[PDB]
C-alpha cells in the first residue's frame, strides 16, 4: 500500500514516457547526484560563493597549462600532479636544464606552480613552438618526463628524433606573434526550431592525394562544397589530439592540442570562422569516454601514480574491455575540472558551436557495453549543463549511444540526461540487411516504415543511412552495396547504365531521402557518400604497409559531369537545400498514410509536406492515389527522377496537383501522382 512516488526531479521525464515509473527512484538518484556535484563545482570559489559553471570551466582553462603574458611578457604555468614530490619545467629554452626551472609552489590541490620572468631581452622566456616537457621527481626519487597535460599542441618527431628517442610526440609551446582574429559571427540558429543537416568530415582525408591533407586546404577546398550541399553544421572527427592517425581520432593522447598533422592552432581558427562566414555550424568529436593508454605524450602514469586521471588497474575498472585505453575517473573533481574546462576551451578559443560526445555506451554502463555507471553519467549531465550554458539556445550536443539509454536525450529539468540528439546508430544495418539477404520484391515497406519511426518520444535523433564506421575497411558502403566496384567505366553518362548501375544510382537516392524524411529528427552524412564515393575508407596501419591509398576522397569525380558521381551529388544538394526551403526535420513525426506491401508505395506527411516512395522493382503506377489532409494545389519541390540527379525525367514537376474531396487512406482528400519504379517525390502545398 506504499505510495508509488515519483520524485520531483524525474517528474518531467516519468510524464514524457510513464514506462519510466518503476524506475523513477533509481532515475532519480542519478541526477541527484549530478546536482550536488553541480552544486560542489559552483561553490569551488576562495570564498565559497556562488559562481556560475562556465566561470569555473573558463577560469580552469584560463589558469591551467602555459599562459604567455602578452603585456608583462611573462610565462605562467601550473600543472596537477599530486603523487610527485618535485616538478621542472625542461625543454628548448634552458638546454633540457633540470634544476634550474623548478617548480617549486606545490598547492594544497596537488598542482604545482612557476612563472617565468621575461628575458634580459624582454622577449619570452620560452621561443614560440619550441619543445618542452615537465619532469617530475617521485618520492622514491625517481623520474619521469611527460608533456603538459593541457599543452595546445604536440607534435610527431622528426625522422632524426623518431630514429633517437621513439615515435613519443613532443609538446611544444605555442605563442605565435598574431594569433588568428575571429572575423565572423556565429550562423543564426536555434537548436528547439531549427533543422540541423550534418556533414561528417575528417580533414585528413579530404583530398584525392594520398597525405595528411590540411585544414587550409579544408577550407579553401571542402568548404566551398559543404555550402553548395547545402548542410548547415560539419561534424569534425579527429581533431583532438592522436599519435595514432588509424585510430580514426578515439585514442586522444593530447585533450587541449588541436592535431597538428593538418596545421597549426591558427589554421583551425581560419577553418571555422570562414565555415562561420559561410553559416556553416562546426560541431567537433569530443571523445571523454577514455584515453590513450600513451605515457609521457598522454595521461597514463601521468605523476607517477596509477589513481590520478584514471581509475586503477587493480581497482577493476581502469581499463576498457576491448580498446587497449585507460578509463579516467569522473568522481576525482580534478579530472571534473580537466574534461570541463576542456569543453568550454573548444567553444571559446575555437569557436566550435557543439560537440558530438563518442563512447557514450562505453560511458553509461559499469560493463561499457560488453549497470549503470552513475559518476559517468553524472559528468555527461554536468557536461550538457556546461555546453548548453555556453551557447544558450543554439549549443548542440549529440550523443553517440548504441544502447539508446532512455532519458539521455530528455532535458535535465526533466531528470534525463541533457543531449540534443542520439544518433540513429541502428539505421545503417537496416539498409544493409535488405540489399545482403532481400531481393527487391521481399521488402517488407511495413518493417521499413516500423525501424525507421521506432523512436523514443522527447529523445530527437539525428538519422543516417550510413557512417563513417561503414565506409571504413571491414565494412561496404551502400554504393559498394548497389553497385559494386563500379569504374568510370561503368559509371560514364555517354552510355545506358547497366540494369545493376541503374537500379543503384535510383535506391541510393531514395535511401537517403526516406531516411532524411522519416528516420529522424537531424541528417548526417558521412564525406564522400553523398556522391556514392567508390571504394572504401582505410588508414595508414601495419595492416595494409601504411597505405594511405584509400585514406583520401576521391573529390574530383563530382567535378566530371560526364560520370555519374555528379548526379549523386546534385540530387543530395537538392535534398539539404529543399528540406532547408520546407522544414521536415526538427518537426513532429511524420503521419504515415500508406506503407502498401504489394505496390511496395510508401507515403506519408510530415510538416505539411506530402512524401512519395515507389520502391517496386518493376512496376510503376499512373494516377496513383495519395491521401492528403489539407486540400489546395500541391507542386513538386523534389524529384529523384530528375535528369540532372540522374534520372530517366519521366515525371513533369511543373504539374499542378489538385486535391478532391473524396476520403482516400484515412485522408479528406487525395491527389493523384505518376510514380515509375524506383522513384520518389516530395510535394508542397502552395499558399
Same mark, same amino acid.
Not at 609551446?173 to 543537416?197: C, E, G, M, T, V
Not at 548504441?402 to 539505421?427: I, N, Q
Given at each position: 500500500?506504499?505510495?508509488?512516488?515519483?520524485?520531483?526531479?524525474?517528474?518531467?521525464?516519468? +510524464?514524457?514516457?510513464?514506462?519510466?515509473?518503476?524506475?523513477?527512484?533509481?532515475?532519480?538518484?542519478?541526477?541527484?547526484?549530478?546536482?550536488?556535484?553541480?552544486?560542489?563545482?559552483?561553490?569551488?570559489?576562495?570564498?565559497?560563493?556562488?559562481?556560475?559553471?562556465?566561470?569555473?570551466?573558463?577560469?580552469?582553462?584560463?589558469?591551467?597549462?602555459?599562459?604567455?603574458?602578452?603585456?608583462?611578457?611573462?610565462?605562467?604555468?601550473?600543472?596537477?600532479?599530486?603523487?610527485?614530490?618535485?616538478?621542472?619545467?625542461?625543454?628548448?629554452?634552458?638546454?633540457?636544464?633540470?634544476? +634550474?626551472?623548478?617548480?617549486?609552489?606545490?598547492?594544497?590541490?596537488?598542482?604545482?606552480?612557476?612563472?617565468?620572468?621575461?628575458?634580459?631581452?624582454?622577449?619570452?622566456?620560452?621561443?614560440?613552438?619550441?619543445?618542452?616537457?615537465?619532469?617530475?621527481?617521485?618520492?622514491?626519487?625517481?623520474?619521469?618526463?611527460?608533456?603538459?597535460?593541457?599543452?595546445?599542441?604536440?607534435?610527431?618527431?622528426?625522422?632524426?628524433?623518431?630514429?633517437?628517442?621513439?615515435?613519443?610526440?613532443?609538446?611544444?609551446?605555442?605563442?605565435?606573434?598574431?594569433?588568428?582574429?575571429?572575423?565572423?559571427?556565429?550562423?543564426?540558429?536555434?537548436?528547439?526550431?531549427?533543422?540541423?543537416?550534418?556533414?561528417?568530415?575528417?580533414?585528413?582525408?579530404?583530398?584525392?592525394?594520398?597525405?595528411?591533407?590540411?585544414?587550409?586546404?579544408?577550407?579553401?577546398?571542402?568548404?566551398?562544397?559543404?555550402?553548395?550541399?547545402?548542410?548547415?553544421?560539419?561534424?569534425?572527427?579527429?581533431?583532438?589530439?592522436?599519435?595514432?592517425?588509424? +585510430?580514426?581520432?578515439?585514442?586522444?593522447?593530447?585533450?587541449?592540442?588541436?592535431?597538428?598533422?593538418?596545421?597549426?592552432?591558427?589554421?583551425?581558427?581560419?577553418?571555422?570562422?570562414?565555415?562561420?562566414?559561410?553559416?556553416?555550424?562546426?560541431?567537433?568529436?569530443?571523445?571523454?569516454?577514455?584515453?590513450?593508454?600513451?605515457?609521457?605524450?598522454?595521461?597514463?602514469?601521468?605523476?607517477?601514480?596509477?589513481?590520478?586521471?584514471?581509475?586503477?588497474?587493480?581497482?577493476?575498472?581502469?581499463?576498457?574491455?576491448?580498446?587497449?585505453?585507460?578509463?579516467?575517473?569522473?568522481?576525482?573533481?580534478?579530472?571534473?575540472?580537466?574534461?570541463?574546462?576542456?569543453?568550454?576551451?573548444?567553444? %571559446?578559443?575555437?569557436?566550435?558551436?557543439?560537440?558530438?560526445?563518442?563512447?557514450?555506451?562505453?560511458?553509461?554502463?559499469?560493463?561499457?557495453?560488453?549497470?549503470?555507471?552513475?559518476?559517468?553519467?553524472?559528468?555527461?549531465?554536468?557536461?550538457?549543463?556546461?555546453?548548453?550554458?555556453?551557447?544558450?539556445?543554439?549549443?548542440?550536443?549529440?550523443?553517440?549511444?548504441?544502447?539508446?539509454?532512455?532519458?539521455?536525450?530528455?532535458?535535465?529539468?526533466?531528470?534525463?540526461?541533457?543531449? %540534443?540528439?542520439?544518433?540513429?546508430?541502428?539505421?545503417?544495418?537496416?539498409?544493409?540487411?535488405?540489399?545482403?539477404?532481400?531481393?527487391?520484391?521481399?521488402?517488407?515497406?511495413?518493417?521499413?516504415?516500423?525501424?525507421?519511426?521506432?523512436?523514443?518520444?522527447?529523445?530527437?535523433?539525428?538519422?543516417?543511412?550510413?557512417?563513417?564506421?561503414?565506409?571504413?575497411?571491414?565494412?561496404?558502403?551502400?554504393?559498394?552495396?548497389?553497385?559494386?566496384?563500379?569504374?568510370?567505366?561503368?559509371?560514364?553518362?555517354?552510355?545506358?547504365?547497366?540494369?545493376?548501375?541503374?537500379?543503384?544510382?535510383?535506391?541510393?537516392?531514395?535511401?537517403?531521402?526516406?531516411?532524411?524524411?522519416?528516420?529522424?529528427?537531424?541528417?548526417?552524412?558521412?564525406?564522400?557518400?553523398?556522391?556514392?564515393?567508390?571504394?572504401?575508407?582505410?588508414?595508414?596501419?601495419?595492416?595494409?604497409?601504411?597505405?594511405?591509398?584509400?585514406?583520401?576522397?576521391?573529390?574530383?569525380?563530382?567535378? %566530371?559531369?560526364?560520370?555519374?558521381?555528379?548526379?549523386?551529388?546534385?540530387?543530395?544538394?537538392?535534398?539539404?537545400?529543399?528540406?532547408?526551403?520546407?522544414?521536415?526535420?526538427?518537426?513532429?513525426?511524420?503521419?504515415?498514410?500508406?506503407?502498401?506491401?504489394?505496390?511496395?508505395?510508401?507515403?506519408?506527411?510530415?510538416?505539411?509536406?506530402?512524401?512519395?516512395?515507389?520502391?517496386?522493382?518493376?512496376?510503376?503506377?499512373? %494516377?496513383?492515389?495519395?491521401?492528403?489532409?489539407?486540400?489546395?494545389?500541391?507542386?513538386?519541390?523534389?524529384?529523384?527522377?530528375?535528369?540532372?540527379?540522374?534520372?530517366?525525367?519521366?515525371?513533369?514537376?511543373?504539374?499542378?496537383?489538385?486535391?478532391?474531396?473524396?476520403?482516400?487512406?484515412?485522408?479528406?482528400?487525395?491527389?493523384?501522382?505518376?510514380?515509375?519504379?524506383?522513384?520518389?517525390?516530395?510535394?508542397?502545398?502552395?499558399?
Amino acid at each position: 500500500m506504499s505510495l508509488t512516488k515519483i520524485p520531483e526531479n524525474v517528474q518531467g521525464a516519468v +510524464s514524457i514516457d510513464p514506462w519510466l515509473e518503476p524506475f523513477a527512484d533509481v532515475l532519480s538518484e542519478r541526477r541527484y547526484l549530478a546536482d550536488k556535484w553541480l552544486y560542489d563545482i559552483k561553490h569551488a570559489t576562495p570564498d565559497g560563493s556562488e559562481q556560475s559553471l562556465v566561470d569555473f570551466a573558463r577560469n580552469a582553462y584560463k589558469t591551467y597549462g602555459l599562459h604567455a603574458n602578452q603585456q608583462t611578457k611573462e610565462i605562467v604555468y601550473r600543472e596537477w600532479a599530486p603523487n610527485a614530490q618535485r616538478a621542472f619545467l625542461v625543454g628548448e629554452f634552458n638546454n633540457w636544464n633540470e634544476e +634550474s626551472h623548478e617548480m617549486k609552489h606545490k598547492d594544497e590541490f596537488g598542482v604545482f606552480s612557476i612563472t617565468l620572468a621575461p628575458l634580459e631581452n624582454g622577449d619570452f622566456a620560452i621561443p614560440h613552438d619550441s619543445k618542452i616537457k615537465v619532469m617530475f621527481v617521485l618520492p622514491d626519487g625517481s623520474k619521469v618526463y611527460r608533456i603538459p597535460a593541457w599543452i595546445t599542441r604536440a607534435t610527431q618527431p622528426s625522422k632524426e628524433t623518431a630514429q633517437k628517442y621513439g615515435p613519443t610526440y613532443e609538446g611544444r609551446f605555442w605563442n605565435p606573434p598574431n594569433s588568428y582574429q575571429f572575423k565572423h559571427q556565429r550562423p543564426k540558429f536555434n537548436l528547439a526550431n531549427d533543422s540541423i543537416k550534418i556533414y561528417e568530415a575528417h580533414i585528413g582525408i579530404s583530398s584525392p592525394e594520398p597525405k595528411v591533407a590540411s585544414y587550409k586546404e579544408f577550407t579553401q577546398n571542402v568548404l566551398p562544397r559543404i555550402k553548395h550541399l547545402g548542410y548547415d553544421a560539419i561534424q569534425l572527427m579527429a581533431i583532438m589530439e592522436h599519435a595514432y592517425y588509424a +585510430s580514426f581520432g578515439y585514442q586522444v593522447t593530447n585533450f587541449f592540442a588541436i592535431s597538428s598533422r593538418y596545421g597549426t592552432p591558427e589554421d583551425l581558427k581560419e577553418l571555422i570562422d570562414t565555415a562561420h562566414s559561410m553559416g556553416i555550424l562546426v560541431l567537433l568529436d569530443v571523445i571523454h569516454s577514455h584515453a590513450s593508454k600513451n605515457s609521457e605524450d598522454g595521461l597514463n602514469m601521468f605523476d607517477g601514480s596509477d589513481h590520478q586521471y584514471f581509475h586503477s588497474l587493480t581497482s577493476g575498472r581502469g581499463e576498457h574491455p576491448l580498446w587497449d585505453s585507460r578509463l579516467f575517473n569522473y568522481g576525482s573533481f580534478e579530472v571534473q575540472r580537466f574534461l570541463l574546462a576542456n569543453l568550454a576551451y573548444y567553444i %571559446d578559443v575555437y569557436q566550435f558551436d557543439g560537440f558530438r560526445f563518442d563512447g557514450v555506451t562505453s560511458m553509461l554502463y559499469l560493463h561499457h557495453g560488453v549497470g549503470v555507471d552513475h559518476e559517468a553519467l553524472a559528468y555527461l549531465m554536468l557536461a550538457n549543463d556546461l555546453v548548453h550554458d555556453l551557447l544558450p539556445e543554439s549549443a548542440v550536443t549529440i550523443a553517440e549511444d548504441v544502447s539508446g539509454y532512455p532519458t539521455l536525450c530528455l532535458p535535465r529539468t526533466a531528470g534525463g540526461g541533457g543531449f %540534443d540528439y542520439r544518433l540513429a546508430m541502428a539505421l545503417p544495418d537496416m539498409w544493409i540487411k535488405l540489399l545482403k539477404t532481400k531481393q527487391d520484391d521481399d521488402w517488407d515497406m511495413g518493417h521499413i516504415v516500423h525501424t525507421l519511426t521506432n523512436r523514443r518520444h522527447g529523445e530527437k535523433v539525428v538519422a543516417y543511412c550510413e557512417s563513417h564506421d561503414q565506409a571504413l575497411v571491414g565494412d561496404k558502403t551502400l554504393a559498394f552495396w548497389l553497385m559494386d566496384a563500379a569504374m568510370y567505366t561503368d559509371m560514364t553518362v555517354l552510355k545506358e547504365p547497366t540494369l545493376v548501375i541503374d537500379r543503384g544510382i535510383a535506391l541510393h537516392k531514395m535511401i537517403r531521402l526516406i531516411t532524411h524524411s522519416l528516420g529522424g529528427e537531424a541528417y548526417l552524412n558521412f564525406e564522400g557518400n553523398e556522391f556514392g564515393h567508390p571504394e572504401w575508407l582505410d588508414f595508414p596501419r601495419v595492416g595494409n604497409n601504411d597505405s594511405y591509398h584509400y585514406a583520401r576522397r576521391q573529390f574530383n569525380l563530382v567535378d %566530371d559531369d560526364l560520370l555519374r558521381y555528379r548526379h549523386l551529388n546534385e540530387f543530395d544538394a537538392a535534398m539539404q537545400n529543399c528540406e532547408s526551403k520546407h522544414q521536415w526535420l526538427n518537426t513532429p513525426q511524420a503521419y504515415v498514410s500508406l506503407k502498401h506491401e504489394v505496390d511496395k508505395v510508401i507515403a506519408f506527411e510530415r510538416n505539411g509536406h506530402l512524401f512519395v516512395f515507389n520502391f517496386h522493382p518493376t512496376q510503376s503506377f499512373t %494516377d496513383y492515389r495519395i491521401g492528403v489532409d489539407v486540400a489546395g494545389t500541391y507542386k513538386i519541390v523534389l524529384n529523384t527522377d530528375r535528369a540532372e540527379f540522374g534520372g530517366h525525367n519521366r515525371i513533369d514537376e511543373a504539374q499542378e496537383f489538385f486535391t478532391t474531396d473524396l476520403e482516400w487512406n484515412n485522408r479528406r482528400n487525395f491527389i493523384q501522382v505518376y510514380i515509375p519504379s524506383r522513384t520518389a517525390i516530395v510535394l508542397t502545398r502552395q499558399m
